[PDB]
Amino acid sequence: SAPADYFRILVQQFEVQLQQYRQQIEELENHLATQSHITPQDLSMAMQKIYQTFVALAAQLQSIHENVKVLKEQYLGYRKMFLGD
């Protein structure tokens, strides 16, 4: 279906964006003038984990999408059985 194809395309585009933005932000960070006791490396590590959360969330939403597909298949299976086929 169009929605399912568009979802797949959005996920691929999201992955690309994550890769690109990760680098763009990393370059913004090494240009930080700091020190307080927070090094650019401290910020970089924190940002890296933020990136990891975004990757996780995208994967989790993809799994939700797939499980809703399963749900639909099971609905159809039940309906078919209910109707004697």
Binding site: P3, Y21, Q24, L28, V68, K72, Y75, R79
Partner: protein, 40 residues
């Protein structure tokens, strides 16, 4: 005092915001899926 470049922080924030919006678009499609599924 502790001076920081808000323009830079905002630039970082805007990148993350766009990623948040991406996830939100995925959700929209799932909501459409849930609205459309029919037992019969």
């Amino acid at each position: 005092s502790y001076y920081i470049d808000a323009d830079l922080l905002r630039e970082i924030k805007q990148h993350l915001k766009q990623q948040q919006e991406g996830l939100s678009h995925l959700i929209s499609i799932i909501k459409d899926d849930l609205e459309d599924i029919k037992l019969v």
